[PDB]
Paper text:
The first procapsid form, prohead I, is built from 775 copies of the head protein pb8 arranged into 11 pentamers and 120 hexamers, as well as a dodecamer of the portal protein pb7 located at the 12th vertex. The DNA-filled capsid is decorated with 120 copies of the 17.3 kDa protein pb10, which binds as a monomer to the centre of each hexamer. Basic principles of T5 capsid assembly and maturation have been established and follow the phage HK97 paradigm. Here we investigate the properties of pb10, the decoration protein of bacteriophage T5 capsid.
To explore the nature of the interaction between pb10 and the major capsid protein pb8, we first searched for the position of pb10 on capsid structures determined by cryo-electron microscopy and image reconstruction. Two density regions corresponding to a single hexamer of the empty expanded capsid observed without and with pb10 were obtained (estimated resolution of 8 and 9 Å, respectively). Pb8 adopts the major capsid protein fold first observed in the X-ray structure of the phage HK97 capsid, and its 3D structure was modelled on this basis. Six copies of this pb8 model were fit into the density of one hexamer in both cryoEM maps and the density corresponding to pb10 was identified. We did not observe any additional density inside the capsid in the map of the pb10-bound capsid, showing that pb10 is located at the outer surface of the capsid. The density corresponding to pb10 observed at the centre of each pb8 hexamer has a size compatible with the NTD of pb10. It appears as an averaged low-resolution lump, likely due to the superposition of one pb10 monomer in each of 6 quasi-equivalent positions on the hexamer. The CTD density is not distinguishable from the noise, suggesting that its position relative to the capsid is variable. The centre of the hexamers is formed by six copies of the A-loop of pb8 (named by homology with the equivalent loop in the HK97 capsid protein) and its surface is negatively charged due to the presence of multiple aspartate and glutamate residues in these loops. No shift of the non-expanded procapsid band was observed in the presence of pb10. This shows that the structural reorganization of the capsid protein subunits that takes place upon expansion creates the binding sites for the decoration protein, as observed in other phages.
Numbering used by the authors:
A (entry chain E), B (entry chain D), C (entry chain C), D (entry chain B), E (entry chain A), F (entry chain F): 164 to 455
The structure:
Amino acid sequence: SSSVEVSSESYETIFSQRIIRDLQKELVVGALFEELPMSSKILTMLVEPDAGKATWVAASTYGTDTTTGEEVKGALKEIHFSTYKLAAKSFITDETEEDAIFSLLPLLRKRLIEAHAVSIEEAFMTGDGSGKPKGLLTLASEDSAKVVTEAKADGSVLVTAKTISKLRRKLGRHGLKLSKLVLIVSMDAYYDLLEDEEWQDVAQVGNDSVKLQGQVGRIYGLPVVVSEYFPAKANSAEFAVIVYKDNFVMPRQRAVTVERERQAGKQRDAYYVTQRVNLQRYFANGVVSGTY
Amino acid sequence: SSSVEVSSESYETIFSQRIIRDLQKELVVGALFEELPMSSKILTMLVEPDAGKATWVAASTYGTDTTTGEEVKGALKEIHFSTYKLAAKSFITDETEEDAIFSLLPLLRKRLIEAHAVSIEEAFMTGDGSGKPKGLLTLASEDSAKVVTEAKADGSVLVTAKTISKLRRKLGRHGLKLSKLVLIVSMDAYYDLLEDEEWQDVAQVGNDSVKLQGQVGRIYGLPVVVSEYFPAKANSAEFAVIVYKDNFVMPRQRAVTVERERQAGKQRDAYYVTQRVNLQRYFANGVVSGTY
Amino acid sequence: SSSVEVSSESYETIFSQRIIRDLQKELVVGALFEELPMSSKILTMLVEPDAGKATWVAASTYGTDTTTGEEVKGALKEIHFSTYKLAAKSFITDETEEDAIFSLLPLLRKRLIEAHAVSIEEAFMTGDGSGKPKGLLTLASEDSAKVVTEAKADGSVLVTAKTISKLRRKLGRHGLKLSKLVLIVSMDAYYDLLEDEEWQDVAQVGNDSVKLQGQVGRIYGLPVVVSEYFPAKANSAEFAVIVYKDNFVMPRQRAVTVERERQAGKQRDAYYVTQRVNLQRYFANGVVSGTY
Amino acid sequence: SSSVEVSSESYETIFSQRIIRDLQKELVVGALFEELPMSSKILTMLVEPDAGKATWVAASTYGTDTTTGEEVKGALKEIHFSTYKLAAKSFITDETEEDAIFSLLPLLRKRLIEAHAVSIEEAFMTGDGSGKPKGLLTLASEDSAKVVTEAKADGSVLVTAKTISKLRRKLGRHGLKLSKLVLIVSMDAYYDLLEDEEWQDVAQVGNDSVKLQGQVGRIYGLPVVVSEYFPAKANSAEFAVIVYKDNFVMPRQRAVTVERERQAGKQRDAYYVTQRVNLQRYFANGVVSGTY
Amino acid sequence: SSSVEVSSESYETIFSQRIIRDLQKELVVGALFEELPMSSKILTMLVEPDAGKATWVAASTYGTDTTTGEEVKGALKEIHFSTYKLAAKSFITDETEEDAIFSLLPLLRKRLIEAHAVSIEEAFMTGDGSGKPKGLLTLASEDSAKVVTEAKADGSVLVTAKTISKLRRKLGRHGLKLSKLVLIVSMDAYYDLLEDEEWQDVAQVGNDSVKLQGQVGRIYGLPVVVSEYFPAKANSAEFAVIVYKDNFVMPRQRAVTVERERQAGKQRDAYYVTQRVNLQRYFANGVVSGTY
Amino acid sequence: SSSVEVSSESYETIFSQRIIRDLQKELVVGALFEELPMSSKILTMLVEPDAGKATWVAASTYGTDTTTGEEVKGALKEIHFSTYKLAAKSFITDETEEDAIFSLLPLLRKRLIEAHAVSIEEAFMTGDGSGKPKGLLTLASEDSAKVVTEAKADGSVLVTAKTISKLRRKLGRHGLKLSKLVLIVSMDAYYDLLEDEEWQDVAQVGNDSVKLQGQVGRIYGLPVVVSEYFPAKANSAEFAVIVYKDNFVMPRQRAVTVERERQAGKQRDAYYVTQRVNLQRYFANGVVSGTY
């Protein structure tokens, strides 16, 4: 009846009262370590490691230098945990905040913190270490630690299940355990439709329940971390396996705090979120990936 | 003997009493949602889910002027919920009813309703949205979502079970689950008997029981909703896979009511049966279809 | 020494006493439904299942005249179940019975009833249905219903077991159930020795018994009704699979009776045997056979 | 020194105290039926099982002339079961008995009876039926039954278990059972270690014991009567599978008796053992054998 | 520096002490039977099995002259068991015993007895039957009894498990059981590694226990008696399988006694170790070996 | 702004700190026997195992003179248990020690003893035994005993699992058992995925635990002493399997001790570690390795 430019504009318009989030993916992997508070400029350590060496000496007296005899070493290595600053800044103007909707500022604050955390997780996963923490698929990669798939447990010809097993027993050479798997979402999809020598398929069987879905999706009974924080290289899959109780800790030189001023050349409200963070490192075989 | 046009018409004949219904098929799929009453003629549901986010900042001073900018945000996105009208009339006259049958109308009101129910399902199940409730295949198919089978879960070649698993995983990256499957009766026939890995049939073993068939007809323990409200593309399949308790609601802006009049030019009996409906939508990857 | 033409005929020979039947099997399959007595020359009855229908109408008015709404019809259809006559007749002479024996007749009456009973089953199983009851391999097949195997649930390669399952599914599409299965004795002896991937055979486990044999030979746990009244073709196997207690009734307008006269020009005994029976039909998927 | 014809004959010489018998197999097959006591020369039985069947009549009339009228029959067939003579005799003289052992005669009398018994079994197992009982195999094989393996359940290729099955389902179709099986030792000695699809053998499983053996040495749980009294052929193996409690009876006009006379020239001693026996023949297909 | 002829010889140096006996293996295989004491140089006995027979007689008289006269016979046959001699000696001297080890004789006497016991086992395992017992493989192989595996239970292509399987059948044809099997060390190692249709070896599974090693090394749940006293034929392998509790007794006309003399015209110490043994032979199908 | 060579090295530095050992493995394979302390220069002792054996005697008198003479012996043969010397010294001075760390000697001394323990285990594992003790592998392989696989109880074909079983039997044909297996890590990776009849592997199953891993890595349920002190021969594996408590003893004529002097021309800190050891041998078949 009424058209626009009659009286259409005078009727009820509902707005989204209660909204959903931007970003609904959990933040783990980058923080999946002991989170240790720190305040120091640097932290420096040393290890024993050893002395002497000893051999086989024919004896028959007390004190013998007749044959073989004195043997010593001292050794090394000092190591320094090098700390980084990671931080963010954001604007809002009174100009934007004042219309008739003043509910924006409360909402905004809880996006900022959530957003600083995202950038940390991505920085820990992929990051070169300049201006950012020590990577996880940089220190376990082919790029700067030279770790690919295990070829000391490959005769010729591999398969996708096999690769996980092969990397797992590379960790037990390094003497450590496995306690979580971090896998690409595609990989886990493939392993959900598991191929087994049970021949029932533990994604389903005949009688299906939450027990089965939650068993197939765990490999070796362990939390698979489904994550999307991986480049796709080619048809290759990247994996990160290591222990997560005997591995690395996140020393945080400043725990996340939100800092705030009004000043940016007028007033205006300016927001600072600031953390300072790193990864520990002791070994380059101390975390293991492999390229399919 | 007794021949017709002689004396055959003065003896016995039987007539029916009680009568089979038209369509003994259960109406579901289009009525497989929660039914929410609405009194509001439009809903303008502005979503509101975020303010600020994060940044990477060096900090260590009260006011920092050297690092990155700050962030301040509004929020988005208004959603207009628009209802449509579905309804029909039936014109009848006493003049046709006049013979010796007068029990026609007590069945007929409930034939018209049952029939009006069919078209409600067909429109709910498949539909553009223009003058009809939002369509279920359509909203989740290539037509207006570009949602087909997940190509990031397949190398090439997809067997019938294997498809379902690609769609199952697609669902959980959304944040939603699966609790029933809607399949075509001809597709449903290769799941009624399926050739399976236990190598005995888990439809029937050697010693069929209603239990084994009731387990197999639940793909993943989840009921398959056998329906015949599906287009036919080719030897390609169609699926409707979603959760049916967390997805979309069916909002009914006028529930079905029967108005009755007797005015059409004389008397005459006039019936008007009228409803108003739509379906909710937030996302169109919140529902899943796919292409075999 | 003693031989024919001495005195051998005057001495000892022990001549016949007692007889064993003709056919030491049960007569099955025609009689496998309810058998209801009637007294009504024709069961004319009208079956009316639907009235109304309704549609989607956009309204915004009480009396909605703006678009058509009006939906109403009567329905159809009338059917007539017409009884047929089956009969058997015999005329003998006193001369044939007599030589010193006159006990033939009380036994003659049984054989007549029994042989009649056989024809009835012949007529129910295969029969054009005009003057006699309609078939069950002549009704239910390609001959007069277009009902064979279900090709739309085949993959490719029909094998015998597969054929029964596809056919089973063809029944549940129709809405009717299965409660007995009717099969060919030649096929039966190979449902008795069914292949199963249980892999020890459940008809000779290695802890062998009559139980396993009486299980395997009951396809789906429902009794196999061994029957052999089937036509020939090549080596196609036909089956009769239907619900046998929620379908057709056999209606009896005349119960078995023997009407006995002597007078036939001479005496003579004249024996007339009469029954009036039919088969019902409701739909052209009301019963299912399939061709292999 | 010491040689024969010195002092070696008065030295100890040990002679046999006890002996084995020639034959240590239990008799079986031909004394495995009912042993019916009898005293008549012949049993002449006439079986009369069926009289009357009538016809399906066309009705509204009693003493039909629109079809063939009222049927009645008498019946056939007289059959005569005639005993045959089995007699065996032996004779000794006082010259035969005397050596230095007088104690042979109670043993000889046992031996003759046993020896005669073998001849009864030999004839009952295979026998023309002319001055001996009819042979069980001589009426079950190709010899005059003309009953071999059913073509009607071979797609091509027969194996030993299938041949037994083929033979078994002939039985259930002549109205009889299987209650024992008679087989050939060489074939029985292949179910000693029985190949099967467990592949771990269901003859011995994992932990061989006597129980498993005496159960697997049966086919259908029913005792395999391990014998070697069948004739040689080639690589063909004939069996007998029939009921052994609803089958052919032995009518014994004389139960086995021991007769002793002395007289025949001088005295001297004579041992005669005589029985008069036959095997029934109710049907020529009332026993089933077959050619492998 | 110091060596023989300087000062090396004056330091304590450790010379021999503490003995170990010749052969660390149990004397069995010829000693597996009952050792029955006897005192009779030769044992002469008949074994009586049966006397007369009694052939079928037609009868209907009390002296049957119409048939062949009575059967009768004595009993055969006479058997001689002849003892053989086995002994060993040592002639040592007073000069030998004098001049290093005077405690040699208490050990030397034990070795003479023990060494004789092995030589006895050599005579029982394979024996000429001339001056020494009758052999054990000798009476059971082709050497003097023409017993190889039964070619009339061959299904073509004899394999290891099967040879035993045929051999067991040959046993039941004698009517004697199988209770242990005596094999060659090298075969026994392959039989320990039995491959069965579990396809995993029941030798050690994957879940080993002493029971499974103690189970594999039993064939048919009967223990194998592992031995080395066998000849190596060719590529053919000797097996010896019989009952070992209802077969051959070893009759001993003298038990092992140690006899001691000193004279030979001088003294000198003379040690004589003596036994007298024979081995029963009833049949040559009373012990069964074979050729591979 | 700041850089090194400005003030940075003096600004608040975390110097090196703490420690972790080298040889992050337990000493195995050398320590795997009874360790007997000894205090004797040599033990020179006679193997004592037989004294006479005699032979058979036909008798006929208390003595004989007809047959062979008598046996009686002392005993053969002397063996000498000889020690070797293993040892080394190490040189350090006060000049080296004076920097700013004086916790070096308390660590250097532990390392030295540990470093000596390694050169002992090395020599114990492989060695010529000439001035060191015997090589465990060397004596056992084909280098010095001519012992490879048991290829007189092997027919055709082998796998890794088989090669162990060939060795396993080879021990017991000297009466010896098994109580450990020694294996190369490269092989150990291949026993991780043990191929078995339960056909899921007992290393994962579907559900893993430390227990399954501890069953599959113990071949026969007995500890595999996993070690990496093995020579890498080629694509061949060596193994060492013998009994390790019913065989060889390791006799130690001097236990490990540390002697220390400070004088040799200057002072100077001098350490001497010295020990004396041998490994016994008794036969060349009393320790077994194998070439895969």
